[PDB]
Structure formats: C-alpha cells, structure tokens
Amino acid sequence: TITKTLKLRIVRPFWQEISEIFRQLQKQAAEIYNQSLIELYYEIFIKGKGIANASSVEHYLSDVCYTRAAELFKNAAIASGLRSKIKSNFRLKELKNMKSGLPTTKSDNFPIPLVFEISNFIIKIPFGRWQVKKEIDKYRPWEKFDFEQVQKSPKPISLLLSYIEVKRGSSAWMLNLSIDVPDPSIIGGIAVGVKSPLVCAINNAFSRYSISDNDLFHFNKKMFARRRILLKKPITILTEKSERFRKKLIERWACEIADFFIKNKVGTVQMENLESMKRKEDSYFNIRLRGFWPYAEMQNKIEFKLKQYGIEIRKVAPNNTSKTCSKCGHLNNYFNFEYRKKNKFPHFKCEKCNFKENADYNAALNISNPKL
Amino acid sequence: KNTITKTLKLRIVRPYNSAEVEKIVADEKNNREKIALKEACSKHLKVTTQVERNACLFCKARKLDDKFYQKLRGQFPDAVFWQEISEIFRQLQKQAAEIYNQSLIELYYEIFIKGKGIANASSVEHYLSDVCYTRAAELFKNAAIASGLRSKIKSNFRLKELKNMKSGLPTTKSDNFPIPLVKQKGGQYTGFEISNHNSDFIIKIPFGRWQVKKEIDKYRPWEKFDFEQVQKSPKPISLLLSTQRRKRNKGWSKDEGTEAEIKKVMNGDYQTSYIEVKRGSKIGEKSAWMLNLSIDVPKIDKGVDPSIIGGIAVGVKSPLVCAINNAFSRYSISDNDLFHFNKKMFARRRILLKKNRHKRAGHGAKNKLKPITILTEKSERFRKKLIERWACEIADFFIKNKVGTVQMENLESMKRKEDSYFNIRLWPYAEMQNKIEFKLKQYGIEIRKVAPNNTSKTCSKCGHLNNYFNFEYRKKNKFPHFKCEKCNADYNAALNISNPKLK
RNA sequence: CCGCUUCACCAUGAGUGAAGGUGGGCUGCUUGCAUCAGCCUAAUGUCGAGAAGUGCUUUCUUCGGAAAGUAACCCUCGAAACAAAAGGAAUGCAACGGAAAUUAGGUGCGCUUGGC
DNA sequence: GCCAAGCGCACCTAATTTCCCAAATTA
DNA sequence: TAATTTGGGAAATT
Ligand SMILES: [Zn+2]
Ligand SMILES: [Zn+2]
Ligand SMILES: [Zn+2]
Secondary structure (H helix, E strand, C coil): CEEEEEEEEECCCCCHHHHHHHHHHHHHHHHHHHHHHHHHHHHHHHHCCCCCCHHHHHHHHHHHHHHHHHHCCCCHHHHHHHHHHHHHHCCHHHHHCCCCCCCCCCCCCCCEEECCEEECCEEEECCECCEECCCCCCCCCCCCEECCCCCCCECCEEEEECCEEEEECCCCEEEEEEEEECCCCCEEEEEECCCCCEEEEECCCCCEEECCCHHHHHHHHHHHHHHHHHCCCHHHHHHHHHHHHHHHHHHHHHHHHHHHHHHCCCCEEECCCCHHHCCCCCCHHHHHHCCCCCHHHHHHHHHHHHHCCCCEEECCCCCCCCCCCCCCCCCCCCCCHHHHHHCCCCCCCCCCCCCCCCHHHHHHHHHHCCCC | CCEEEEEEEEEEEEEECCHHHHHHHHHHHHHHHHHHCCCECHHHCCCCCECCHHHCHHHHCCCCCHHHHHHHHHHCCCCCCHHHHHHHHHHHHHHHHHHHHHHHHHHHHHHHHCCCCCCCCCHHHHHHHHHHHHHHHHHHCCHHHHHHHHHHHHCCCCHHHHHCCCCCCCCCCCCCCCEEEECCEECCEECCEEECCCCCEEEEECCECEEECCCCCCCCCCCCEEECCCCCCECCEEEEECCCCHHHCCHHHCCCCHHHHHHHHHHCCCCCCEEEEEEEEECCCCEEEEEEEEEEEECCCCCCEEEEEEEEECCCCCCCEEEECCCCCCEECCCCHHHHHHHHHHHCCCHHHHHCCCCCCCCCHHHHCHHHHHHHHHHHHHHHHHHHHHHHHHHHHHHHHCEEEEEEECHHHHHCCCCCHHHHCCCCHHHHHHHHHHHHHHHCCEECCECCCCCCCCCCCCCCCCCCCCHHHHHHHCCCCCCCCCCCHHHHHHHCCCCCCCC
C-alpha cells in the first residue's frame, strides 16, 4: 500500500512567534537526531566489542532517544516521529560492513515530525502552551521558548495553507503530510515515423511515446565505417553481428512500446499492416535505412509482447496517414512527402481547423482513430 | 609565506630493492643486451637503418622474464616485489578509509556529546592528536600513516560549521582513498629520503615488517597482513618513480617548471614532507600506482608593480579579456580550441543511455552509467588543460606589461552575468578563476576578486552610466561596438573591472 | 550510408556533385590536441557472480519491529583492446597542484494530484 | 510529452574550504 | 638519530 505525500505552503496561521518556534524545534530535534546516531554508533562499534543486535538498538532508542526528545519537547508526537526517524537511519548491517558512516543532517533540511483536524485550507494540530524562558542561555541563543505538556496545557495551533512534517522550502514553510492509499474502450495507435522510427499515441488522450534512433544511428555509422575500411570473410561476420544487434534492438523497442501502453491502461492498440509500412515512401525506415530492415520481426515482437501484457492488437489500413488531420480530418493535399523534402521536414498544419504539431504524432493520432 | 605548495604526480615503476638486488637486476639486463649483440634505434645505431625503439631488438632484449624473477625470489628471499606491495597498498587504502570514518565519529562524540561542545579551534589540535592519531597508531603502528591521517581528517572536520549544524560529519565512500604519509621537514628534519641512483627518482617510505595473517576473514579478504611497528622492527619500502618521458620533455633543460621542480626534488634542494599514494587506472588485473609528492616552491619574482592595476572580465565575443588601468594594451582569449571542445562534448552526449531505463539495466547504477562516467572523465581533463592554457596566456600578458595587482569579476557576477560567452554559446568558474589566480600567485601578481557596479554599460573613459547598451539592445543590433552619451564592448567591461574604486 | 571533414555550389539544412576519412575506442609508461604503429569494436553493446540495501513472498510477535527466502531494481562487485607489472614501446605542439570533504543546484526515473 | 509541485533515490556538477606542521620526548 | 607523540579549554538567525 503506497504513501501519497501532499506538501502545501503555511503562508498564514500570530506569525513571527510561529517562525521562531519552528526554527527552534528544527534545531533542537536535529541535535537529538545527530547526537543519537553518533552516541549509538559509538556504543555498538567504538565501545561494545564491535557487535550488538537490534535488541540493543531498541533498548537505546526506546530508553535514551525517546526519553530525551520527550522530556525536552513534552509532545509525544514529535518524540515518537523522531524516535522512528533515528531507528530508520541507524541501519545496523549497512554499518557492520564499514561500507560507510552515519547520515548526519544539517539543522535546516531536517523536517520537524508531528501527528489531523482540517477545514476548507486550515490545518489544526495539538501543541503544548509555550511560555518563554526568563533565563536565556548565553551559548544557546536560538532556543527562546520552553514547551509544556499537551495534556496539562494544550494550546493547539492552526495553519491556513495554500504522519505530518514541517520544513523550509527548496524562506517560507512547507507542510508535508503522507496519507495511506491503496480498459478495452480506450484505443491506441502505433505509426512508423520519419524522424522517430515508431511513434505511439492514444485517441481522445494527449499522451505519447516516440522511439529515438540515437542507439540505431550511432551503431549504423560505426558499421558503415568498419565496412569502408574493410573494402581496402570478415564483412560476412559483421553482417551476422549486425543482425544480432538489430534483433535485440527491436525487442527493446517492443518492451518500451508495451510499457507505454500498459501505463495508460490502453487495452486495444492498432497499427497499419505489413505492406502499408513496408512501402510508405515517407517512413524513417525507407528514407534513412534504404528500405532494408526486418519489418515482419518488428511487428511480431511488438504484437507478442503487447499480447503478453493482455493488450489486443488490431491491424488497420493507412487512409492518407501523413496528409489527413487528426483533430478534424481535412486532407492538406499540399502536405506531399515532396513538399516536406524541399523544406527541413516541418510540423503539420490543418488550415481548416488550424492544428500545427509533429507530423509523426499527427500520423499516430490518425491511426489510433477507431473507424480505420 | 614567501613560498607556494604544489604537487608532483609521479607514476611508481616498481618497488626498488637493496644495492645488491638492483645491481644483479641491472647486470642481467646488460647481460641480455650483450648476448643479443639488421635495423636499430638511435642508441643502438651509435652501437643499419633507424627504426622506432618499440621495433628495436637491442631495446626489446633487456625486458626480463619470470625465469629470472624466480631465480631472484630464490637468491634474495627478503627483497620486495610488486605483488606483496600492491596487496599492502590495497589493504592500506581500505584501512585508511575505515579509520577516517570511525575517527570523524569518535571525534564528533568526544567534542560535542562527551565534551558538551566546550571546544575552540586549538582544543581541536588536542582532540585530533588524542582521538584520531591514537586510533591510526593502534592500527598502522607507523607514525607516518598515523600523522598523515591526522592531517587528512583535520582538513575535513570543521568545528564551527559542525557545532551550528551548517553541515554533516564527513564520510568517505571511495574504492580508491589515498594513503597519506607525513615525514617532518625543515630544521634538523629532511622529509622523505629521496635518492637518485644513476639518475632515477627513488623515494623511501618508512615501514615495518609484514607477516601474512594466519586466520584471514572470509567476508573481507583484503586484510591480508599484520604490520610490526617501524621503531621496533623496520622494513622500509623504496619506490622507483618514472622520470624518463620527462627527461625528454625539453623542459628538462630549463630553470622554471615541473621538470625543474622534479630535478630539484631529486637533487635534494626541495624537500617533501607529504606524499599521498593512490591507484591510477587498471592495466591488467593490476593497477597504476601514482605517488603525489607535495613540495613548496619559492615565488619567481620577475619585476611586477602593484602601482599598475589590471583587469579580467568575461566577454561575449571572447570568453575572457584583459586590461590595464591606463596603458591601452589588452589581451583576448581566442575561442578556437573552445569550439573544437564544444563539437566534442556534443558527441559525448549519451542522453538515451542516461534516460531510457531499458538500456544497460539490472547490474546496478555503477554499470548503468559506465559509458557516461568514462566520457566525463575524458572531458573534464580537456577543460582542465584548456583553462590552464588560458591562465598561462593571461599570466604571460600581465607579466610582459609588469602588473602586480589584477582585479577580476566576482564569481556570482560571471556565473549569473547573463551576457557571458559561457551563457550565450555553451562551465566551472571556481576552477577557471582558481587556475588563473594560482598562476598569477606563482610570479607575484595579487588577485582581488572585485564588485561590478554596472560594468558592461559604464563609460571606461568619462564615467557616464548608460541603460541603452543593455543586453537586449546590444543583442538586437547583435553585439555591436560601444559608444557613450557624455563623451569595443568586452575591452570596456574588463577596463571597468580594472577600476581601483571598486570593493 | 555521413545528424563526418573539406572544395564548392544551392535553398539554418537528416540539401546536390567531387575527393578523402572510424564517423567509436584501447596501450605507447603525468595530461590535452594532432599524428604514427599495433589492437578491440554488436560496446549508446552483451553478460557473469553476488546479497549490503529499496522492494516482494512467507512467518513471528513482547505489534516498534524481528526471522527467513527470493533476485525486479540508477541493487552490489566485475568483464574488449599494443609488443614479448620490473621502464619493450613513439613524433609534433601545448600545458602540468593535488587530495579529501562539505554545501548547493540540477539531471535522470517512478508515483500522488491537474491541464494543454 | 511537457509543465508544475513534491517526494524518494542516486548521480553529477559547481563552488568553497582546508591541508600539505612544528616541537619535544623516547627508544 | 629517527620515529613517535603531543599540542587546550563555549557566544544564532531574521
Ligand atoms: Zn483539421
Ligand atoms: Zn634500441
Ligand atoms: Zn564617456
């Protein structure tokens, strides 16, 4: 069961009294925490024969740490959240490695623990009645206020914000709280691109995934180079190795496509048939890889992985993919591959509904249309 | 004082031995060169067609084989060879990091927890020696490693920052942590015994006998050896350090620079009192062991006047520009080598391997990033040497014109200028600024990192403070020449950093 | 083939002709850039061994947690590259202060809310 | 896919800081 | 003569 953490700014609650109280509880708790990890490490390792169990870490944390941070703060919530915060961070086996030392925080980025009442928003938290101390320590000049019990003098404080924590923002005071929290209709579309090998998209949604050819292009470069140099039989062996790389690459694109669909729940996905993305004339594969590629294996790996995640693959027809508009459907007859080559492969533009973006995602959304 | 500290980073060839064992090594090498004697290298033409040494046989003759080294491990059974030394240094690098961590913790505990925080900057000398030295001396039984660790801790333990909790107790998480080593120098003391037998750079590190552990741990096998105390029963380790490629460097026949510093440390003129040994790069299974000597060299003191005050400012056309209060002589750091570097750091941009998460996956994060990690190591060596070359240039300039104070734009002013060559067309300003500072130091020049006061706009001659030559205006014309309302851009910006008025 | 260089020429270029070329890396003994000799290169790859940790499954409770197991993990350690460890190994130009740590911000990925 | 906001985890990059001692005592 | 050990004593952020 997961923990959703909402963190919203205590802009108002008076004020400066609250800011000063927070600074002080931050510092005071950071002392207990750093000094408790240190006092504890010192007792197991640097004194106690270099051995102790979770038994002793328990005896110490329950006795020394909780009794200190409770006899000071007089607030069960702070002392208990803090007791947990040390227990968490004193990992006895991580330390028996001498793999590293101790997580010792600076008294700023250290969150105040706390453990409620809320209206629409005003948070409301049980806190002790603080009276200022009449004798201020010369050497500890940041601690001004001494707190009282939350049963004997409960002065519960409210905060108008725009397991509970309080902490600085990276001047203003964020308040976190964690809470405990535990589709065959939605249709998706995969279309072979011209700048991205395969771009997949969802109909009536805005979400997409585009497959980068960086890995593919870099490999292709190096392979051509070895060829050029070899042409002044190893070239046969380069062929077999090259095939092994392409085969594993297609598997990795199939995993990435399947993951992008399973994320958005997309339970039916459709993509143009073998002939329709073998002879597309504007496809990445034909205009970069000189129409030499294993299309069959690509579609077969994609469909096998996509059916191994419960998603159903439907094999549609193109119906003027590049040219037709996703959002309305007026063919921009000007948008010939020919038009696109003379330029530097620009975005789409439907002059009828006025919707300009990436012709590959356009094509993707043209596929994903159910009436195909 | 009148001096400046530097390292000399030096590669360990092989552990050196007795005069006996090294005599027999040498004489077998000449024995094989005499045995062997169509083509040759120059040394073996003077003893035909010239070939590169790699291809020569009267060089290739000498390299000794395990047959001899076994005949030697037989003859002289106490002599020291690479295996035992590499095992020892691997142990000492682990034990050192373990000590550095448990010592910072014991120190934190004895100052704040036990003490109750009643500590100033001099009781810290006390606590360091008591806690941290004593711990290291129980382990290593070798004052030099113990005293070396005292210092390597003292460097990272900040008492006022640690009391006001403006940071956390430092902890090292490193495979390759230096072994530090302190022998005292100056007065009746000399530092580490440097020798030069037949012009080779030998350093002798004080060490105690080592006997391999009977019952070795299963979980940490590296802890193999059990050091005697050096005062009790000593076995020193002498290292031969490589000075061959430097003996060819053309700087080896010069009065200033790294080659002359090495010649001085070998001659005995400079003494070393800190060495710091750590591994370089894996060669087979087995590594390159670097030894980083630390010397203090005097100031060069070629005539400079504090009367003449100079300026450095980050310029739009050229990445640094240099000026003098009232001379009219300038310098501009050309942007040619930086451009070659920018083309390269585009190639080394594995954004897919960084982000995909299907790639290089299921062996942990050290291997997920190996490709990227290896390119940043090679790239941050490019930038370093480039920055050094500029600082070299800048220094030469000021020295020519005889400047003694150089004011340079404060780190914030540059890092967030928003019209720097580094911002417009691209960076470490700590490193860039430090490397310039440190070069100038060496000759006598004094840097004072100064405040801007509307630098880019202010008239360098009459004093008018403009708002017309603002970034977007100049950007709009596209970085045009500079003129004033009351009477080059980069030159002006530098020459208003060269204003003694600023603070 | 080029999201390689240069010679150009056309309309910033994943344009067209001509010539060339790892267009990626490893060793050459401190480093960088360029050569050079030899090499690896499916390397933005492929995989091995492991259990410290995030998680997970099973139990146990004195309900904080504890003990087992798995092995998904930006989980842990590791894996290509000169010649025949011990100066066998270059040419040109340029440089050479290193180490440790802290702090900050950011990159990268997952989720809880919302939109384009 | 990006943006905004924050959390959790690990890595990367930049900036800063500090050390690289000296004296006295004991084998 | 070289290696080893010792050195001293509070005070913040908006
Ligand atoms: Zn339309
Ligand atoms: Zn020769
Ligand atoms: Zn003027």
